[PDB]
RNA sequence: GUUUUCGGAACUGAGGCCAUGAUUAAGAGGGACGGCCGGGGGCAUUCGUAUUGCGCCGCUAGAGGUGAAAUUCUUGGACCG
């Protein structure tokens, strides 16, 4: 797992798909094409209590672990690909995206272009729930 | 015992005459004509992302869900790309 390239002149790029719902966050790193992956730790991996799996703490620890693994293998520059749960459920990102991005930037890498790739439907099927909604 | 005067009513030919003869165009209505306007209607095409299932590839022990959990799917590779 070594590479005889230059390090001072330029940097090696990858992309990171940050998928964040209201109950779990994902920090997934692939190559530029996206077929081949590098590392993934989810927000339920760090905390052992499944209540706050979408906490900023678990997203911060997962982003720090992903950045440590990427520095171990040799990825320095990274393109952010932000995604919520999408569909017809909601479009607001979950409560770990900003914390994971700040932890990933503070770890000592380089950030390129931030992109929102949440699936926006053009009038898809019926949303889950009744006509009166979830009354609680 | 003629046929008139002793006269009861329908129709047509030709001319003259009438100041010869049809009130208007509703801030009523119908219709026609000209340029448009509108997720108005019917039929046949065409496009968009999303959902689900399936085929292949790569890292992988968690993923879903809740106020909190569980039923649920998972090294026979779930979730994610």
What would you note in describing this structure?
- By secondary structure, the protein is of the alpha/beta class.
- It is 24% helix and 25% strand.
- The protein is built from three helices and five strands.
- Strands 3-2-1-4-5 form a five-stranded mixed sheet.
- Helix 2 runs parallel beside helix 3.
- The longest helix has 18 residues, at 56-73.
- The chain is elongated.
- The protein starts with 12 loop residues before the first strand and ends in a 20-residue tail after the last strand.
- The protein binds one RNA strand of 81 nucleotides through residues 15, 17, 19, 23-24, 26, 28-31, 34-40, 42, 44-45, 50-51, 86-88, 119-126, 136.
- The PDB classes it as ribosome.
- The entry lists the keywords HCV, ires, 40S, ribosome.
């Amino acid at each position: 797992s070594l590479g005889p390239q230059v390090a001072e002149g330029e940097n090696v790029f990858g992309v990171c798909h940050i998928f964040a719902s209201f109950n779990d966050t994902f920090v997934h790193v692939t190559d530029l094409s996206g077929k081949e992956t590098i590392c993934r730790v989810t927000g339920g991996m760090k905390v052992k209590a499944d209540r706050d799996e979408s906490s900023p703490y678990a997203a911060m620890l997962a982003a720090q672990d992903v950045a440590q693994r990427c520095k171990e293998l040799g990825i320095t520059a990274l393109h952010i690909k932000l995604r919520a749960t999408g569909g017809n459920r909601t479009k607001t990102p979950g409560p770990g995206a900003q914390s994971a991005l700040r932890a990933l930037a503070r770890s000592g890498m380089k950030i390129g272009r931030i992109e929102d790739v949440t699936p926006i439907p053009s009038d898809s099927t019926r949303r889950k729930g009744g006509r009166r909604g979830r009354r609680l």
